[PDB]
Amino acid sequence: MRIENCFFCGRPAWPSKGITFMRNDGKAFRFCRSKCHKNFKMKRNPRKLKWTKAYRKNAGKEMVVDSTLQFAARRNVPVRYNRELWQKTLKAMERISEIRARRERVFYKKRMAGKRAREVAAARKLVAENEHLLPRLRGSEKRRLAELAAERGVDVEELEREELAKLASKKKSKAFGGEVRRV
């Protein structure tokens, strides 16, 4: 047996999975699932459906140029069976898989490099426009810190900073409404 691939989306097609369409010109179309089969019957383009490997290649979101992608091919010239060749092939398959995985991760990071700079710029703009929503001590808490600093001879700004630390550590959500007392 062998593992085929879906014509429409590109997923691995295993035995008894999906359905094959035989056309009168002599071409056969293997689909992994009824989703791909029904989209094909609705004449949707796989290149425009964003969940397909066709779209991902056309958008450049899959690693398409690599040395590790040259090892798998449809071999139309058979090789006489050789036990040593098959075992070294299996070892090659493992090593190729590992190398391909690391190179794919590098490719994804090179796609996603600029995110940190964009997010930092957006955060700076948001903070600059909304400085007034930053956490703040209560007026009663400020007065109590001021009188405690006057009593203990300590720094009111210092007391304010550890109180900001405490109210930053303690997160309390507010509830809607409230019970009405019965008569």
């Binding site: 309390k172 959500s173 509830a175 809607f176 409404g177």
Partner: protein, 110 residues
């Protein structure tokens, strides 16, 4: 170990409790499952809902009940004379940014 008067915040997954329910009955059943959840959590058969919690349930009509709702249930003492139940639960809706990703928490008394 746990006192009679106690408030906890819970996340009720109303989606699995309203799966397959008739459209004209989804929101009233949601009210009843909120009462049943509070009774199971606090042991109190007397459950009183906040009108804001009712608005939160009914916000998108009779069949647009949210999948998750973040509630605070407060078990309190019934001080009214001649009361069959000495304890009751009061359930309020909680203002959180997103009802997902939250654990059951105990509300501080202060």
């Amino acid at each position: 170990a746990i006192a009679d008067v106690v408030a906890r915040e819970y996340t009720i997954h109303l989606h699995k409790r309203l799966h397959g329910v008739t459209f004209k009955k989804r929101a009233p059943r949601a009210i009843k499952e909120i009462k049943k959840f509070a009774q199971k959590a606090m042991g109190t058969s007397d459950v009183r809902l906040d009108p804001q919690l009712n608005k939160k349930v009914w916000e998108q009509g009779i069949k647009g009940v949210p999948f998750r709702i973040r509630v605070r249930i407060s078990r309190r003492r019934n001080d009214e004379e001649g009361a069959k139940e000495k304890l009751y639960s009061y359930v309020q809706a909680v203002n959180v940014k997103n009802p997902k990703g939250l654990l059951t928490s105990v509300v501080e008394e202060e």
